[PDB]
């Protein structure tokens, strides 16, 4: 194997063989939340439920959550279809908008001159003379010459003059303007509502409904992740924080943002507003890779299967975008409007699956490990040695999977860092961690209900059995195959794990 | 170090430094048939103008061809900031259409450098193209388009007997689904990368620009991946053929494909190609490998390669140098023709052959050296590789020598 | 990081670290039949005593055998500082003589652990040896002696059906030239090293020592290379059977074979062995692999295998750790037989099986861990590997555990 | 492929198919100086003639050098058997010895050492005399003292001014005028003896190629030999011998002052234990390959052949491992020098060193160098790599380097290509000073310089090409790598050529 030989090897007439190891994330809204539909999506690929909180009442969303779990335990008895499904709360996050034009729309021209006001007296009065935006400190951030984007980039402006609560500007790019539309100020250290006053109410609601992770919107500094961390508080200290990066300053300070966050979202489109089309894919590839390094998870969202909103199949251009995002090393890719409000929210999960599977054939597979095996330094942490021993063993006998008995999920994280080829089956009694686990590439979680036992050995022996049967049923392996097992820690005890190579009964 | 460590280091705040190494092909048409316009399209990065035969009588084309050439030479007053422009005949196709035979003869006798042959499915399907071009077109390079499913099915044999390959993704995503086409593309490119023959990615490039001065970041990303998949050229269509911002289109494509460059892992692309290549015994190839290895060993500003038929510069290119291959030639066909090759920056020598064979060589090498300087690639004091023959008439380019810029 | 950088680093002023990992076999005769002597030979490094069955009859062997065991057990005082001592019957042959079969029967029925069967040629021969030993001694180990050109000619099939190989360079020196014999030795040792089956090389070791208390530096060198070639044991002949300094001869063999260690480059020997070996369906192999691989990842002070059969400890040995393999066993034949393998230090558990498994395992594991400390292999605080089973009477050793020395 | 796979491939029924690439050094005296014998040895593999200066009058040696160059140019009548034999001067160097036994005498007993010159011819098993005047100055109570081929170690119970009283340890038949050793003390200079300077002078005069400086124990020691050879001998290669502990101790500085190294195994074997010597060997050879510098393995090699027609298997293998460790040249002594089989030894020596090539991990060796080696700004380095790569790209029969100095054909060797480097030269010295280098085969150009550089190159290239065919390095219709030289002004840059064999 060389990488290039591997590319020449590819075969579009050969059917996928590997598990899809990328977790699918779906945004639930209007078209998706009916328990029956929700049931179909779980069954047909879904791994996480996104809640878009720039909308809804809490009563709206709490019902949506209730439906999710209804559909989840709808499969309670059957090992063939039982999968954890997780719930993710995506805050609305700090944002700027324009006013209401005559409150309906105006029209903007090229090169023309625009004035902007903070003056709320000019809130519902809005047009080509003056525009108003809810940001009150815009003058202490923006300087002369600064470009300002408006309504999904579609209209840019600059800055000729700036004083106190006004700014005279000059349109660089034109197009029809409208009411209450989004505004970005590229390269600008946007002064802070760290978390919105709304966000704290949705964060608290989040803690209340036992969500798994928060996708914290619009993150710029370390402190920002630290805010959501604190607001979540002792009450919510196992809620995973995934910071969205949606603007230039995020890419800039991305190093400390990853240190603080539990994970990372690449908002491609929102990135596309403040930084040029020719530069974004670098920034994506950079962030993804830096996460793969950090061992933290990375979600790839925006502009995925959006064709599927009105058609039952995606454009080939879109087939590409996802695949070459699987490949740069995203753990998960998130569907947006195609599940939340489309006319094909079902095919969308279906396609997104089909696609993410095909793409596994092009993952440079065996080599991925072989590299970090070597270069990896010498430890003294036994847990490290044990995982290598496991992934090594994994490869010594083409095992069909590596069953890891974990509470936290940590021990099955470690193992995934060494990127084995065979899937990791993370077996857990903590129904949380089972969910907070789709965030991780090539980990397939499995919920153990059978309860704790006195003698460690016979307890371990039990869940290994559980995994073995689930595994047989999914088709991870037959009888008379070998599999690698990490037990957990014994509960005396030295905090040491145990690697086992056991044949499948 | 590592592929991954590369990705981690990427920075969208530090300007690209390497030059674009992927060749921009453009489809010329109503939006761009203007001589006055083409003077801005090659100044902005066009390296091949493509003619779409699907819509034309010869007088339609012949005038356009003439208009291309007319604007090419409008720079000849500076022999170094000057650059070749090939011309491409893209057949209308459906085997070999009998309309086409009437059109191939037009090309053959219009000095077209390459033929993008259409709906190619077999060896017979390209052999049949070949003979039609005849002895008056034994040179002219034919690039098969893979469009049906069978092209991907019988690809090796097509590659076996073609000069180039064009993947037309649109016309692929129609016979085969989306979950599979990107797979098809990656394999093809990769397979041309091995065999040495050049490959170009076409269709759905910067389409959104047909009605807008900037493109979608989804398009920036589709184009750059073709770059990094190992493509030599990306070809524009409606963006410059019938578009509304054709010039603006080209400049973007350049901009993109230059950014893209920051993400190619050379230090391993080379390594793998070198490892796969056979032990063959062209004196002329063995120099290339040596030439590349040495370019890496001293971090050379460029590899200068004096060549007749291009084939020398081709070989150096096969092994993917980090540094630019400046091909120096008089044969201005294999010079225009050069552009279907990654990282080759061909340059036309207009100086009358010199009396002494040493004097001749020294002139051409000092030319490339002066092109390379003003063009940006190196500065006085740097180190460059240089390939020349040992004597003249040697059916070989097999001298290699590391020499400082003056 | 490089074979060469290792070589440059060596130091004749730096006292050695590693324990000798190569087995010392000695030949018992007049100079060493003594019990008073043997008590000083095993104390000084003998791990397998060899009875030379060319010149002798059974009563004289039986007294020597008994002499050995009498001095062996004379250290049973501490169950920790005591070492197994295997017993070797070296047949005389010139296929299988009547005198052999008579002598083999004496061996099979004397608890001998291994038979060095002489002048083996084709596959048929070891087979003819097997039969002789029958079900009575199915356990005894067959070490094929290679002594002429036919051995080296048909070596694969021989190896394919012996338990081990002895290279007799002297007797191999007669049959083929000097300039080729090292070539032959290097290949055999290396072929055994692959196959996993242990190799001993003998003859021309420390002959000079028969008369002198110290050997020639060319003997120092010849032995050390046999070590570095990948031998498991080097065996002394006349040096200790007749020599005026037989005991003095062993300490040197140790001393040399220990210094030799500093020039082994494990950090590759492992990587190569591993790269060559195929995938298993057997859990007990895969664990070894993982264990040795883990032993490098954390620089483990040792690898502790708990084994019945031996096969568990043998596996770990095949992949060649830097770390010493302490095999803990009850079966004291395997404990003895264990000496045939590089870097396995076998220990005998004289403790009676415990009631619970947990109980049983934890005792044997604390055994090695104590023996370990007692020797030099680790100190309190170090990390070690530990390879037990899961349920008892399981077909396998397949538990990998990384534990701190208490 | 992998090292171990390689070890498994080895076939003793398959005949050697590689150039010997270890140059053979023979010691010449009594048994070997007849021109007619020297002829048969040159034909049979000799590459360097050693002269042992512990003996012989200058006119003795003077003649011996002449007979060599007589038999050398005996073949120059053609270019096919003609090899550039080289001449090496081996100083006798500093020595400490003991007087005449009052021809000798002889465990646990107590013995007295005297500086007292009156006792010179008055030696016996109670009193012993030795030159080294400062012997007591570099000793404490309990320092070992070895005597007569290490045969008699001794400690020291007490010392004062002009006497040492001490205990026997190892014993056996003493003799007279037998050497003594002090492991491992900073032994007193002069580095170069009085006799040494006379012989180094005669060396420069008789135009030898290299000197083998005996007993080198520091950098100072090297520089003394160098300044003695002086401006007149500035191109005579110095190969420091390492014969004691201290040499090994300070071996780093000794290696950069020297042009080369000799591992005196047996002399090493008397001051440092038999269990440690082979480490010292591998260590020194090892550091030398890393240094570019040549390494010669001497002593113990074929001494069995002094009285038998063939060597013992232990001896065969010792040499083979000396080759494999990384030695460029392995030197014969008494077996060529004064034996009953001198021709037969150079034969066996060659045979062995060839067989051994099959077990050198050939194609791998290079691959490490390519990666590990850094970035240069030194065009000459890149061209070398370019050449060796090209060498490998088409399995060249050889890599022909046109060199004056030999510098450039050295680089190429630093990168361990697998094809023989045929070094083509006009300077008939840097041409003999060239066997000291592994897998370099020199060839002497007689044909004279031309003003048209292009055609001067074209000429020697042709020369080499023909030599090469005849030696058997390559047929016609093969490819070969060429480095031309530097030009003539000029840009000091070399030129790599892939040329087919006409
Ligand atoms: O199935 C499914 C789990 C979640 C991430 C990928 N594997
Ligand atoms: O421009 C010009 C050359 C052609 C290929 C890449 N750049
Ligand atoms: O001692 C004892 C074990 C046997 C092989 C080497 N060390
Ligand atoms: O011929 C002979 C070559 C020169 C030195 C090494 N071997």
Author numbering:
A (entry chain D): 24 to 126, 130 to 531
B (entry chain A), C (entry chain C): 24 to 117, 220 to 531
D (entry chain B): 24 to 125, 130 to 133, 136 to 531
What does the paper behind this entry write?
Phosphorylation of residue Y105 inhibits the tetramer formation and pyruvate kinase activity of PKM2. In the crystal structure, PKM2Y105E binds to proline, which was derived from a crystallization condition and might have facilitated a T-state conformation (as did phenylalanine). No significant conformational change around residue Y105E was observed between structures of PKM2Y105E and PKM2Oxalate. The crystal structure could not reveal the mechanism for the inhibition of FBP association. However, it is possible that phosphorylation of Y105 functions during the dynamic transition, which could not be observed in crystal structure. In support of this conjecture, PKM2Y105E has similar enzymatic activity and tetramer formation (compared to PKM2WT) in the absence of FBP. In contrast, the addition of FBP results in significantly less of an increase in the extent of tetramer formation for PKM2Y105E (compared to PKM2WT). Taken together, the mutation Y105E, or phosphorylation of residue Y105, inhibits FBP association and prevents the FBP-induced R-state formation of PKM2. Interestingly, PKM2Y105E showed a slight decrease in activity in the presence, but not the absence, of FBP, with a kcat/Km of 1.2 in the absence of FBP and 4.3 in the presence of FBP. Phosphorylation of residue Y105 inhibits FBP association and prevents the FBP-induced R-state formation of PKM2, but experiences minor effects in the absence of FBP.
